[PDB]
Amino acid sequence: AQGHRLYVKAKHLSFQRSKHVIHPGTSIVKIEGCDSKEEAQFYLGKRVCYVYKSSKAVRGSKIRVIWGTIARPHGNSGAVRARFVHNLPAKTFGSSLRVMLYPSNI
Amino acid sequence: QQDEVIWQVVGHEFCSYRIKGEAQNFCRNEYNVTGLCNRQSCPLANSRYATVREDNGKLYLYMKTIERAHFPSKLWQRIKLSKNYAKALEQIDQQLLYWPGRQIHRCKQRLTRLTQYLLKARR
Amino acid sequence: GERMVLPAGEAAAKYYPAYRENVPKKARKAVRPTKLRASLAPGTVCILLAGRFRGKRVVVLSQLEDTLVVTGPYKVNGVPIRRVNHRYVIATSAPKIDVSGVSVEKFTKAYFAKQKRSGPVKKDEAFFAENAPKNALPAERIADQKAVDAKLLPAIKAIPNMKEYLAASFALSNGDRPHLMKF
Amino acid sequence: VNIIKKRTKPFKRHQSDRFKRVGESWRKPRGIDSCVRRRFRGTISMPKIGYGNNKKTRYCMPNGLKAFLVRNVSDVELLLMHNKTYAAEIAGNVSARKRVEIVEKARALGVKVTNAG
Amino acid sequence: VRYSASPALETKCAKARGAYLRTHFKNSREVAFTINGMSLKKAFIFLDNVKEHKQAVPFRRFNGGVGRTAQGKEFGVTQARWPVKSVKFFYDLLKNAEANAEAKGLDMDKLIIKHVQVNAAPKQRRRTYRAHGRVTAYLSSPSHIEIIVAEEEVSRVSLKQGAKARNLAARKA
RNA sequence: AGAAGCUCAGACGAGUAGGCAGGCGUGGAGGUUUGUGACGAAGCCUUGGGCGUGAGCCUGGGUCGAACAGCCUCUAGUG
RNA sequence: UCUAGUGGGCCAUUUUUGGUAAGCAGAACUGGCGAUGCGGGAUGAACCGAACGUGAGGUUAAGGUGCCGGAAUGUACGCUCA
RNA sequence: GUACGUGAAAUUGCUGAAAGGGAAGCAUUGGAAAUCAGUCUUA
């Protein structure tokens, strides 16, 4: 069953914020195995998606997806910043995202 | 008196052919070509001008002169077209080539749309 | 813009409604050939990242204007000749495959182009029953796929462990970090 | 030039939510100790000229036309020259008969009707 | 007078009305809320039991200061009472409603109380006398009661999804 | 090219007391609109739609029953 | 040229008077608050940074990066056991 | 239907929908559910 998962696991940490002001437009994403801004440089520009399931089958499918792109690194620990077509809901903190391997440059 | 003072009196604000709204005003003048309130296009305010209107499947064109401006009954001359839209366009710019040509584009638009009005009425 | 310049019994155009239909300004953008990634040499084994053939390993035949006319040997991994965008392949460091012996000039945009529709009406159960591998798929396309497939068998048979490598599917497992591993 | 709106939510009056004698229609706060007037963080925002929309797309419907109020066929023929800029909108008090006449004239003129249905 | 409910079309429903009834509106609301949705015969048995102090009408909304009782446990509450005057008015209106069903020609076995509403009628103004030469209101809260009894009574598929569905259909069979 | 129009460019944008300008809305008057209306005016309600930075305006549905409005100006017991 | 509002002020730096002292009274220069949001000082009218049309992107001030909290459980050398 | 033209808001009952661990209301951003229009359809 381990012949799939062409993506990389990630977790939605929070929004771009100060102590008291948030910016929901851009999200902070922590990619598994990425521990520095040098490693995050590889994942800049990749397509990160949030997959979720809902009751009503739009297109006859139970799964909806919010697409997005990795924009720039964040901090020294390898977290990146992402812009999604629809801003991510605030309840998806700690939810898992999927970072595809494309647009590839390797 | 003169065309300038006529426009200053009428035109601008109060006329029986003026339709003001939020910030835009239409000229319902039966002698205006574009339907816009302007010196260029108000035959009340300016000297000899053209225009066109519709009736029962055919079109008629109004024209003016200068020396006869004191006789309202016979001031304005009507010419009638009931042949074709292309021919109607031919008649208009023929009757305006020897005339101030600024109105040829606007008139030909009025003819061609009124003909489209007739076709849509038929359909 | 009058009728003496363009006289006719029907006019050059029937009707002239609305505004002057403002012409766009003359652009200063010229098409230039795409500078493709250096590692995408013809005959290289690359991994398809997206599409119905995700994870498959295929052999690059030729570089198209924007995409790669790529196919794995259809008898190996069952991937017919397709364009794949250069952003959706991973050029692996596997040994190159000799593709000089097969013609690639017949693979063009018109060769892979779809049919014109120009109509919003589409879709049907019979439409899904149509197309398919069984219908359409001209015998000319069949022959080219067979010819190029047979031409690429001798190379992959010469290099050991390449036939099974192509038949396999790429996949990430636990503890694999793409920015570390080199393909 | 596509139609964009700088802001889509309305400007409701401060505390119109909490008091029924205070309607939602906007009023400038004149208070000496008003949080909204002093523009504290988290409080509601006030109308500004910066919020104004593009002069090119202003007053235009999402379809690119401007609604024009129509009372009769004479008002429809006013839109003869501008069927690509204004869309006729029949008045509320027009009877059913004159309404049918207005729509038939608008169709012949090729002028869109915002409340045809 | 028009009723509260869009249903009660005369086909299978019977109505009863009571206007400006000189009884407490708050008590009448508790009785109506208790008997709502019950069958006609079981409603009569319950109202008889309340008049006999065997079952109680639970005071749920207007229950400030009401005492606890052991007969409110059957409804899961603690505060219940036995308003006899309100029971009488509801009993009389239910007699009227079943009489209307008899006249219409319904079946009495499966009659249920489909709808029952109580509205506040215009107050009756009276006067009480307080200390220090003061005069105060002593108003009455009447009730409007109306009762209604009645008998118990594709997506389209994209191109790639369609091709996949066809492939699976062919491969399964 | 409603020359009271059109067009190019740069700089700038806090605000109580206070000043000034341009607008929005209400009652009545002169002019105007071949203006709306018992085939439904005004008013009213609305989990509908559109316009404006805003004051506000328009509209669909329901309720209703005899009048009412746009533009130019006059006026005031005008928010 | 005509006219409105004002003719109770308060705080900070430095200088200073009366005072046992004061979140005390009285002054001098400048900047603030009153009239002024915003980031930081946990919080606060005048402290620090910075002064505000509607937004997008980038970069910073003061202040910060164990968690709450966006950001190194960073690097180097030491002191400290309460 | 004389408790009579129109019949507003406060307040109230019923129904449907949803929320609710010591207030509520509000602003920004999106999810979910509900609802809706433009747009195209054609020239």
From Swiss-Prot, chain A:
PROSITE patterns (alphabetical): RIBOSOMAL_L35AE (PS01105)
Keyword Repressor: no
Cellular location(s): Cytoplasm
InterPro entries documented for this protein: Ribosomal_eL33 (IPR001780), Ribosomal_eL33_CS (IPR018266), Ribosomal_eL33_sf (IPR038661), Transl_B-barrel_sf (IPR009000)
Ribosomal protein among keywords: yes
Signal peptide region: none
GO BP annotation list: cytoplasmic translation; ribosomal large subunit biogenesis
This protein's UniProt keywords: Cytoplasm, Phosphoprotein, Ribonucleoprotein, Ribosomal protein
Phosphoserine: residues carrying this PTM: 96
PANTHER family: 60S RIBOSOMAL PROTEIN L35A
HAMAP family noted in UniProt: Ribosomal_eL33 (MF_00573)
Family assignment from sequence similarity: Belongs to the eukaryotic ribosomal protein eL33 family.
Function: Component of the ribosome, a large ribonucleoprotein complex responsible for the synthesis of proteins in the cell. The small ribosomal subunit (SSU) binds messenger RNAs (mRNAs) and translates the encoded message by selecting cognate aminoacyl-transfer RNA (tRNA) molecules. The large subunit (LSU) contains the ribosomal catalytic site termed the peptidyl transferase center (PTC), which catalyzes the formation of peptide bonds, thereby polymerizing the amino acids delivered by tRNAs into a polypeptide chain.
Other information: There are 2 genes for eL33 in S.pombe.
Protein name according to UniProt: Large ribosomal subunit protein eL33B
Organism: Schizosaccharomyces pombe (strain 972 / ATCC 24843) (Fission yeast)
Swiss-Prot record, chain B:
Location in or out of the cell: Cytoplasm; Nucleus
Membrane-crossing residue ranges in chain numbering: none
Coiled coil: none
Family: Belongs to the MAK16 family.
Protein name: Protein mak16
Species per Swiss-Prot/TrEMBL record: Schizosaccharomyces pombe (strain 972 / ATCC 24843) (Fission yeast)
Species lineage: Eukaryota, Fungi, Dikarya, Ascomycota, Taphrinomycotina
Gene: mak16
Residues of the full protein shown: 2 to 124 of 302
From Swiss-Prot, chain D:
Family annotation (Pfam families): Ribosomal_L32e
Name assigned to this protein: Large ribosomal subunit protein eL32A
Cell compartment(s), UniProt: Cytoplasm; Nucleus
Protein role: Component of the ribosome, a large ribonucleoprotein complex responsible for the synthesis of proteins in the cell. The small ribosomal subunit (SSU) binds messenger RNAs (mRNAs) and translates the encoded message by selecting cognate aminoacyl-transfer RNA (tRNA) molecules. The large subunit (LSU) contains the ribosomal catalytic site termed the peptidyl transferase center (PTC), which catalyzes the formation of peptide bonds, thereby polymerizing the amino acids delivered by tRNAs into a polypeptide chain.
Modified residues (Phosphoserine): 74
Gene label: rpl3202
InterPro entries according to UniProt: Ribosomal_eL32, Ribosomal_eL32_CS, Ribosomal_eL32_sf
Chief place of localization: cytoplasm
GO cellular-component term (any): nucleus
Cited PANTHER family: 60S RIBOSOMAL PROTEIN L32 AND DNA-DIRECTED RNA POLYMERASE II, SUBUNIT N, RIBOSOMAL PROTEIN L32
One example of a Gene Ontology biological process annotation: cytoplasmic translation
Organism: Schizosaccharomyces pombe (strain 972 / ATCC 24843)
Keyword list, A-Z: Cytoplasm, Nucleus, Phosphoprotein, Ribonucleoprotein, Ribosomal protein
Binding partners and assembly: Component of the large ribosomal subunit (LSU). Mature yeast ribosomes consist of a small (40S) and a large (60S) subunit. The 40S small subunit contains 1 molecule of ribosomal RNA (18S rRNA) and at least 33 different proteins. The large 60S subunit contains 3 rRNA molecules (25S, 5.8S and 5S rRNA) and at least 46 different proteins.
Keyword Nucleus: yes
UniProtKB/Swiss-Prot annotation, chain E:
SUPFAM superfamilies hit by this protein: Ribosomal protein L22
Ribonucleoprotein listed as a keyword: yes
Record carries keyword Ligase: no
Source taxon at top rank: Eukaryota
Keywords on record: Cytoplasm, Ribonucleoprotein, Ribosomal protein
GO biological process, one term: cytoplasmic translation
Family: Belongs to the universal ribosomal protein uL22 family.
Subunit details: Component of the large ribosomal subunit (LSU). Mature yeast ribosomes consist of a small (40S) and a large (60S) subunit. The 40S small subunit contains 1 molecule of ribosomal RNA (18S rRNA) and at least 33 different proteins. The large 60S subunit contains 3 rRNA molecules (25S, 5.8S and 5S rRNA) and at least 46 different proteins. uL22 is associated with the polypeptide exit tunnel.
Protein task: Component of the ribosome, a large ribonucleoprotein complex responsible for the synthesis of proteins in the cell. The small ribosomal subunit (SSU) binds messenger RNAs (mRNAs) and translates the encoded message by selecting cognate aminoacyl-transfer RNA (tRNA) molecules. The large subunit (LSU) contains the ribosomal catalytic site termed the peptidyl transferase center (PTC), which catalyzes the formation of peptide bonds, thereby polymerizing the amino acids delivered by tRNAs into a polypeptide chain.
Other facts: There are 2 genes for uL22 in S.pombe.
Name of the protein: Large ribosomal subunit protein uL22A
Gene (name only): rpl1701
